[PDB]
Design a binder for this molecule. Structure first.
Ligand SMILES: Nc1ncnc2c1ncn2[C@@H]1O[C@H](COP(=O)(O)OP(=O)(O)O)[C@@H](O)[C@H]1O
Ligand SMILES: Nc1ncnc2c1ncn2[C@@H]1O[C@H](COP(=O)(O)OP(=O)(O)O)[C@@H](O)[C@H]1O
Ligand SMILES: Nc1ncnc2c1ncn2[C@@H]1O[C@H](COP(=O)(O)OP(=O)(O)O)[C@@H](O)[C@H]1O
Lengths: 490, 72, 218, 483, 477
């Protein structure tokens, strides 16, 4: 037995979608994955799901490698591309089942993809400029939402966005760049989380190497070293010649990762240095690149100019903790965030929220061309493409029409995964975007999407729910290519 | 059992009470507790009990004396 | 709910199997092996150590019973009968609820009372030859024929009263049972010192040794 | 006992979806294999021939409920089913049937003595036809959908207000005449009893007319037989026309000779009489049947005061009015595409009539639409934890059984039951008794309907609660029987 | 798919939850295990039966692993977690069926657990530290009802020293503790009372030839893994150096020339405890040599042979964080219970340092917290309140199983307990575990550690949300 093989391929694609459908979105459910030996696997995102999924049917496999190659380009939306492709496949298979030849389907899908990708460029947003302040803060708070830490959350958002914008790079290409490992969390004791303020640079809690440091020195050349200044029994005891030579080269603040010297206090006040222990290697490289220096395997054999410099060093006790304020180096990379509370363990939620805010702000800072989130883009394309098809004229009317209808599967999945009624929310989105083009007065209504925190229609340009333009463009193009490749098989 | 309480526990309490006291303690079918059963007006008939004592014994011994059922 | 019933049935079956062994007048069973050789015995310990039991928990009962009562002398079949009867009596009350913990508490209280009763009933008549005769007869007539037991009681009691001089009970090495295959089974006595299994190729070397010195040393 | 609970639960689940104005229709195939569409719970249950004896008990309890309240049977089914299904898990916990029985009895008494504390009653009286018609919209919305209630309430109330004599009201006089034709809006009201005849030799202005109801309705030798038949027919018609008989009714056909004989004495030939008319005529004008055509005697002869044909509805129908009570009988004329939707309309009319009669027995009304149900549930479940002993679990379960009904109404409306019941229960603490569920909104929103006037009866609800509780108690007592 | 997958997961959860629901309490029933060969074992422990049983459903395997990993974390309560998770999932049955998404259920459960933590922190009666009387009361509450009834004194003294020889003032005030650095010596032989505690680690190994000095007034133990290192040790000249290489007679005299006493054939199990007791630093790289090569070790050493075997006695250590608890007796059938009891006692001391409290036992704490949630739920609104009440109601499972495996009827006893408990303001009445009768826990002298209770409740709630978060299991068979 066996008939209309394309139907079986479409059913396989639909099954692959239904495996991953409910997992889309931050509030998506988890999945249990079992192998032959019975290993455990719990995850939400579908990229690793398809990475570890055991697919058997060839047509489903094709979707698997298309999702995989989608992952290698932008690393996001693989669930969305798979769902869009499956919906397009089922709609096109239906259209074939009412005897429309698939060549017109493919032509209409290609034309609709081109029309939509051209429409994206004319309806995107570039508000992620220096003037975007409230949107950044509320986007960071939506990333930080469902947390009690939101009482002082606005101050945290302000300080974190200020730190990430100040630490911004300037690469050869010119596009803004930000090092993720440059900033890190740092616990504090005493006053609660409501008083956790900004730290202008990287600070390490260690022994006071030199308390007599000037508040703002004229020049603070950071000289990170690994060799310890300990007495033994080019020098037999590496205590004086190394530090004297590195000071004579020009370095002012000489940092030794190892332990301190017994008499180093006298040397470090007359040379503007200090021996700070427990320097993290992941942070040692960060401070070396901030100053502009590099780690030294050995001081023996550079140090006059290779070792980086800073224009001020502060040695003061803050919130019952003395910190080594090696801040404002040559390159703005040295930064840290103080976490006020009792310990690292109960502050896991706030450090995780700070990390996610950093990630989302760094994602929206680059790729200045941005689009609204929460399904606003899908509703906008669905409004555009139906009318465009109706105004197109040729035999590919139904192809583009079903393309427009299939672009509204993502909002349905988002609404389901948010426990809200899918049909009501998608209908509200589509109706809100109806007047976004029908009535030119409601021109600002184009940025209307789902509020996943509650499941209500709301503007997301103000709310800051943002995605890169390139990610969505390549997602749509990959989905259309996969749909064409599958539909051209019989 | 019908009142819902524990079967053996109620009888244990009743027998413990009746052992020390010559009063014919009874069962109260709302709390599973021993009760004097005289002032509560739970009296049952007498001739019924007297006839029952004979009527149970006769059928008991008759059934217990049977042997080798036959297919007549 | 039903596991208890299964255990009850297995214990009752084991009890019923071991019913017709208790007492000197009780009949004796015989054991057959796959090889063909057979053993004829009545003691409960060997019966439980040699029987091929079907039910699993019955095998549990047999194994644990033998393991515990190896310490004392005997009473194995009596123990099995008593545990089977205990289980049956407890079942007659369990069948109408009666959560097993209450039955356990009753069992423990009865054990305490019985221990005190046995403590106050035990009779401490001073030891002599006659009481040892009686104990030997009672412990021997429950494992072998009547007159064979009567013959063997004198030998065993004389050996034991000989041993008793140390004022401390010791066993194993000090009493040795030799085995041989003479037709006249009526011959059964005790020999002091040691009896060696066999000798060597010596034509009338010493025979009546009388006084001797022992060095051996292999 | 669990099999009986399962049977009652399935029976309740079958008719649960029909609760309220948003009831699903049912495909009803009768014994004689006829198509039938309806949503009324009583109609399907009276057609449902269930087999489990517990189902028999619950259905006959519902029948007794309909006997003296006229409606709410769907409510008692849903309520008793909820009570039994909760009693199922209460028994599964390990409780006894007896103690849950006393708990349910205590809860029922508590509900009965707290019910009269929701006073949203009739305004002034059964009069003010428009006002009471607005009051009578409850059962109309219940059975028929809310689309046609505006006219159905007026048609149903204008007819029952015709004869408000001495405060005594009766149902049997209220009848509905089947008239197919144009749309529903063309339906109207009339006074008396309406049925159609065949011949046109009709006289309108008639004095006291004696109704003649028939128990049994309608070559030389050839000429001799024809003449004999003529003589026999003439003798029969003159026997009919004896004692000055002026009106005659019959379920048979007409004939040219028969109509000639009828017009010989100037008597109308009422023919094609409905099969239901033979004894309703006897009970409405004091008539009686005739074994044949020769023995109409004055002693066994009917008596009607007005016998005239009415052309209302563009159909020829004779209506009897100005009877002995001069207003007792009052029919309702209908108009619709077919009898299928006519049945639901007339059943809604009957429900309105019964609710009005309950109002005659009780001018006291209570809020409806899930208001009183959740109010009683709140009161009972608040009283529950204040009562020590084992009856407390039965009390909370009785409260949950009350909770069940608004959930059923919500899921019939198509909205999420859990969300709306949570919102309604939460608001009822401060948004007091008059709050309740809203039908129109797709979002699960609540709405106060003291202003809406949708208020169900008091005595009917009291009897429904009592009888459903008694039914659940009785079915809980039986243990088993071999089957 | 759909609801069916979650239903299967939670049914497999409930089955293994109620397979051993009777196995806790002082009157636990004994379960029956048979392998398919006739072998028979009689078991009374939940961990053992859950280990030996074989099940295939992934949810059951996950929860069994959760229980197993929670066993080492806290010890006691390893079955109450499973019972609580199973009952919570069994009550979530009724909300999964009425078509509400698992997300609101997870939110309600998390809110309930947040209330759980605060309510537990409220009603817990305070308890002091190291005071003998209520410490022994705790010992009777938890350690007893086992095979150490007639030997509780040895366990008491071992626990009392143990809670004081593993103190870690690393980042706070002694709040850090470990259960693996205690130099326990379980050597059979002699009466069980021969056990004793000795300050400092001791090693089962020593020099093969004792023609040499081992004990010095200032033992500077140095860890180490060719004589070049031997005469490079002279950088500071530590008296004793611990290594893992064999020493010859000429090599031994080379050590004497180097003023060191090396050791051979010593495992890491001894080396790490030596390092903890002495607080030294290991270094062997020639470039890594500095002033920090040698850290001062213990404060004394002794040469002694106990039980006809050569030992090394590191007594009076600089840091009393790795000391010796010697243990001699007939065999090990009593001392595994001693080990678990001392682990429990160290956890009790650690939490009393953290939160010096003891929640009432015998379901009194369960009743208190259930009453707190069922009264708090009345005020807060939302459809999420149904799971909020359901978790509190299902938390009553501990008293019901306690009464169940006692003979008494659970329903009447539970109703009497709850109805009494509501009117009572701050009584925390519980149920006697041996007779199944209501009794105030302060009178009965039964109490539970706060940390283990918090861990049990949090782990149960987390397992519930984990098993209700799963939306599908299909990745193959
Ligand atoms: N807070 C939010 N509200 C609404 N939509 C969101 C939110 N966060 C992310 N999304 C949507 O989720 C989509 C990406 O989800 P997904 O495909 O699961 O990620 P990945 O591809 O990394 O697995 C984006 O297109 C974005 O629109
Ligand atoms: N407009 C309305 N809005 C909400 N509820 C209504 C409305 N109309 C009627 N109801 C409810 O419907 C219930 C009765 O409906 P139903 O069970 O179908 O018939 P019956 O009257 O025989 O019980 C009443 O309890 C009433 O509260
Ligand atoms: N003698 C007792 N009386 C009352 N309650 C007890 C008694 N012994 C233990 N419990 C209760 O039983 C619960 C479970 O403890 P236990 O069964 O000993 O270990 P586990 O929790 O590992 O099964 C404890 O919370 C305790 O309150």
């Amino acid at each position: 037995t066996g008939e209309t093989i394309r139907s079986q391929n479409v059913m396989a694609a639909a099954s692959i979608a239904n495996i991953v459908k409910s997992s889309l979105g931050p509030v998506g459910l988890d999945k249990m994955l079992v192998d032959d030996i019975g290993d455990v696997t719990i995850t939400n995102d579908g990229a690793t799901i398809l990475k570890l999924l055991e697919v058997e049917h060839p047509a489903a496999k094709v979707l698997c490698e298309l999702a995989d190659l989608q992952d290698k380009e932008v690393g996001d939306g693989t669930t969305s591309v798979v769902i869009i492709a499956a919906e397009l496949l089922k709609n096109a298979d239906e259209l074939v089942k009412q005897k429309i030849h698939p060549t017109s389907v493919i032509s209409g899908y290609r034309l609709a993809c081109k029309e939509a990708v051209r429409y994206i460029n004319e309806n995107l947003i570039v508000n992620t400029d220096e003037l975007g302040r409230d949107c950044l803060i509320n986007a960071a708070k939506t990333s930080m939402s469902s947390k009690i830490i939101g009482i002082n959350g606005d101050f945290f958002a302000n300080m974190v966005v200020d730190a990430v914008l100040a630490i911004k790079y300037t690469d050869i290409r010119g596009q803004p760049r930000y090092p993720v490992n440059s900033v890190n969390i740092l616990k504090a004791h005493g006053r609660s989380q409501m008083e956790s303020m900004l730290i202008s640079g990287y600070a390490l809690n260690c022994v006071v190497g030199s308390q007599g440091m000037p508040k703002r020195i004229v020049n603070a050349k950071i000289a990170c070293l690994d060799f310890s200044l300990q007495k033994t029994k080019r020098e037999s005891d590496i205590t004086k010649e190394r530090i004297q030579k590195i000071l004579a080269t020009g370095a002012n603040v000489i940092l030794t990762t190892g332990g301190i010297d017994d008499m180093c206090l006298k040397y470090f006040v007359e040379a503007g240095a200090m021996a700070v222990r427990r320097v993290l290697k992941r942070d040692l490289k960060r401070i070396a690149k901030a100053s502009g220096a590099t780690i030294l395997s050995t001081l023996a054999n550079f140090e006059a100019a290779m070792l980086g410099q800073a224009e001020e060093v502060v040695q003061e006790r803050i919130c019952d903790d003395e910190l080594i304020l090696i801040k404002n180096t040559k390159a703005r990379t040295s930064a840290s965030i103080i976490l006020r509370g009792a310990n690292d363990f109960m502050c896991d939620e706030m450090e995780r929220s700070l990390h996610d805010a950093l990630c989302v702000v760094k994602r929206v800072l680059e790729s200045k061309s941005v689009v609204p989130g929460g399904g606003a883009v899908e509703a906008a394309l669905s409004i555009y493409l139906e009318n465009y098809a109706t105004s197109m004229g040729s035999r590919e009317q139904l192809a583009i029409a079903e393309f427009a209808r299939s672009l509204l599967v993502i909002p349905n999945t988002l609404a389901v995964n948010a426990a809200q009624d899918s049909t009501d929310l998608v209908a509200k989105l589509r109706a809100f975007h109806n007047e976004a083009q029908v009535n030119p007065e409601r021109k600002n209504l184009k940025w209307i999407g789902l509020d996943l925190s509650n499941g209500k229609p709301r503007d997301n340009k103000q709310a800051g729910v943002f995605e890169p333009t390139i990610v969505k463009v390549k997602s749509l193009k990959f989905a259309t290519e996969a749909a064409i490749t599958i539909l051209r098989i019989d | 059992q019908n009142s819902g309480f524990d079967l053996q526990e109620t009888l244990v309490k009743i027998q413990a009470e009746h052992s020390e006291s010559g009063q014919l303690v009874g069962v109260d079918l709302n709390t599973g507790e021993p009760m004097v059963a005289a002032e509560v007006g739970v009296w049952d008939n007498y001739c019924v009990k007297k006839q029952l004592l004979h009527s149970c014994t006769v059928i008991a011994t008759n059934i217990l004396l049977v042997d080798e059922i036959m297919r007549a | 709910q039903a596991a208890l019933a299964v255990n009850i049935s297995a214990a009752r079956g084991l009890q019923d199997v071991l019913r017709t062994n208790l007492g000197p007048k009780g009949t004796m069973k015989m054991l057959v092996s796959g090889a063909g050789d057979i053993k004829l015995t009545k003691d409960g310990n060997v019966l439980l150590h040699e029987m091929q039991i079907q039910h699993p928990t019955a095998s549990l009962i047999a194994k644990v019973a033998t393991a515990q009562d190896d310490i004392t002398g005997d009473g194995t079949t009596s123990n099995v009968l008593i545990i089977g009867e205990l289980l049956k009596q407890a079942d007659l009350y369990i069948s109408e609820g009666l959560h097993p913990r209450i039955i356990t508490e009753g069992f423990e209280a009865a054990k305490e009372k019985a221990l005190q009763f046995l403590e106050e009933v035990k009779v401490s008549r001073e030891m002599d030859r006659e009481t040892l005769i009686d104990v030997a007869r009672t412990s021997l007539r429950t494992k072998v024929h009547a007159e064979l037991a009567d013959v063997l009681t004198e030998a065993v009691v004389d050996s034991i009263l000989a041993i008793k001089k140390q004022d401390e009970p010791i066993d194993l090495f000090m009493i040795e049972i030799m085995e041989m295959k003479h037709k006249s089974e009526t011959d059964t006595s005790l020999i002091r010192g040691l009896v060696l299994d066999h000798g060597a190729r010596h034509p009338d070397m010493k025979k009546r040794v009388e006084d001797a010195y022992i060095l051996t040393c292999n | 006992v669990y099999r009986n609970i399962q049977a009652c639960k399935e029976l309740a689940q079958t008719t649960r979806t029909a609760y309220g104005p948003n009831g699903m229709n049912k495909m009803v195939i009768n014994h004689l294999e006829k198509l039938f569409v309806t949503n009324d719970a009583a109609t399907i249950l009276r057609e449902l021939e269930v087999q489990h004896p517990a189902a028999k008990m619950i259905v006959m309890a519902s029948h007794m409920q309909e006997q003296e309240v006229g409606d709410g049977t769907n409510f008692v089914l849903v309520f008793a089913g909820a009570l039994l299904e909760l009693a199922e898990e209460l028994l599964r916990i390990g409780l006894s049937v007896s103690e849950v029985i006393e708990g349910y009895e205590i809860a029922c008494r508590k509900a009965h003595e707290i019910l009269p504390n929701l006073v949203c009653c009739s305004a002034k009286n059964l009069r003010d036809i428009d006002e009471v018609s607005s009051l009578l919209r409850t059962s109309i919305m219940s059975k028929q959908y809310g689309n046609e209630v505006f006219l159905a309430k007026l048609i149903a109330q204008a007819c029952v207000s015709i004869f408000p004599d001495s405060g005594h009201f009766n149902v049997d006089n209220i009848r509905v005449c089947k008239i197919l034709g144009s749309g529903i809006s063309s339906s109207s009201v009339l006074h008396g009893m309406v049925f159609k005849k065949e011949t046109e030799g009709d006289v309108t202005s008639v004095k006291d007319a004696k109704i003649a109801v028939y128990s049994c309705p309608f070559a030389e030798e050839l000429m001799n037989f024809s003449k004999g038949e003529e003589n026999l027919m003439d003798a029969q018609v003159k026997a009919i026309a004896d004692t000055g008989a002026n009106v005659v009714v019959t379920g048979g056909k007409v004939a040219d000779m028969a109509l000639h004989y009828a017009n010989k004495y100037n008597i109308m030939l009422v023919r094609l009489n409905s099969k239901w008319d033979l004894r309703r005529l006897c009970k409405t004008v004091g008539a009686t049947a005739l074994p044949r055509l020769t023995p109409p005697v004055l002693e066994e002869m009917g008596h009607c005061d007005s016998v005239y044909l009415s052309e209302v509805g563009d159909t020829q129908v004779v209506v009897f009015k100005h009877e002995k009570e001069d207003g007792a009988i009052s029919t309702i004329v209908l108009r619709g595409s077919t009898d299928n939707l006519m049945d639901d309309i007339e059943r809604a009319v009957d429900d309105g009539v019964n609710t009005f009669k309950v109002l005659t027995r009780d001018k006291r009304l209570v809020p409806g639409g899930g208001a009183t149900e959740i109010e009683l549930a709140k009161q009972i479940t608040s009283y529950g934890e204040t009562c020590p002993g084992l009856e407390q679990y039965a009390i909370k379960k009785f409260a949950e059984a009350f909770e069940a009904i608004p959930r059923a109404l919500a899921e019939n409306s198509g909205v999420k039951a859990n969300e709306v019941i949570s919102k309604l229960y939460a608001v009822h603490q401060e948004g007091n008794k008059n709050v309740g569920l809203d039908i129109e909104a797709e979002v699960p929103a609540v709405k106060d309907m003291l202003e809406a006037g949708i208020l169900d009866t008091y005595l009917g609800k009291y009897w429904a609660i009592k009888l459903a509780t008694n039914a659940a108690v009785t079915v809980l007592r039986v243990d088993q029987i071999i089957m | 798919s759909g609801r069916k997958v979650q239903s299967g997961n939670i049914n497999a959860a409930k089955t293994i939850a109620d397979i051993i629901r009777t196995c806790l309490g002082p009157k636990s029933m004994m379960k029956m295990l048979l392998d398919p060969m006739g072998g028979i074992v009689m078991t009374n422990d939940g961990n053992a039966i859950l280990r030996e049983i074989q099940v295939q459903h992934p949810a059951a395997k996950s929860m069994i692993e959760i229980s197993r990993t929670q066993d080492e974390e806290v010890g006691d309560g390893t079955t109450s977690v499973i019972i609580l998770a199973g009952e919570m999932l069994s009550v979530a049955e009724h909300f999964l069926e009425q078509q509400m998404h698992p997300t609101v259920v997870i939110s309600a459960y998390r809110k309930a657990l947040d209330d759980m933590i605060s309510t537990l922190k409220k009603i817990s009666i305070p308890v002091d530290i190291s005071d003998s009387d209520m410490m022994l009361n705790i010992i009777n509450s938890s350690i007893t009802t086992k095979a150490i009834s007639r030997w509780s004194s040895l366990a008491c003294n071992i626990a009392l020293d143990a809670v004081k020889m593993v103190q870690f003032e690393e980042n706070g005030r002694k709040e850090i503790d470990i259960k693996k650095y205690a130099r326990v010596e379980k050597i059979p032989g002699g009466i069980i009372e021969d056990s004793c505690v000795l300050r400092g680690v001791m090693i089962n190994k020593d020099v093969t030839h004792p023609r040499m000095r081992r004990y010095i007034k200032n033992p500077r133990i140095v860890l180490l893994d060719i004589q070049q290192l031997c005469e490079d040790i002279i950088q500071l000249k530590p008296d004793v150096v611990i290594t893992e290489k064999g020493i010859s007679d000429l090599a031994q005299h080379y050590l004497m020339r180097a003023n060191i006493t090396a050791i051979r054939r010593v495992r890491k199990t001894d080396n790490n405890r030596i390092a903890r007791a002495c607080g030294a630093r290991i270094v062997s790289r020639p470039e890594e040599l500095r002033e920090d090569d040698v850290g001062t070790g213990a404060g004394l050493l002794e040469i002694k042979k106990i039980g006809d075997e050569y030992f090394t006695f590191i007594t009076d250590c600089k840091d009393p964080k790795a000391c010796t608890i010697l243990l001699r007796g007939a065999s090990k059938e009593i001392l595994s219970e001693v080990e678990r009891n001392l682990q429990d006692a160290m956890q009790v001391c650690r939490n009393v340092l953290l939160d010096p409290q003891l929640v009432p036992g015998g379901g009194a704490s369960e009743m208190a917290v259930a009453h707190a949630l069922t009264e708090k739920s009345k005020a807060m609104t939302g459809v999420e309140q149904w799971p909020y009440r359901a978790v509190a109601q299902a938390l009553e499972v501990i008293p019901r199983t306690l009464i169940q495996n006692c003979g008494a009827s659970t329903i009447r006893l539970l109703t009497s307990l709850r109805a009494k408990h509501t009117q009572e303001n701050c009584e925390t009445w519980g149920v006697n575990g041996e007779t199944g009768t209501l009794v105030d826990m302060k009178e009965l002298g039964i109490w539970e550690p706060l940390a283990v209770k918090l861990q049990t409740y949090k782990t149960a709630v987390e397992t519930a949300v984990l098993l209700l978060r799963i939306d599908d299991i299909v990745s193959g068979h």
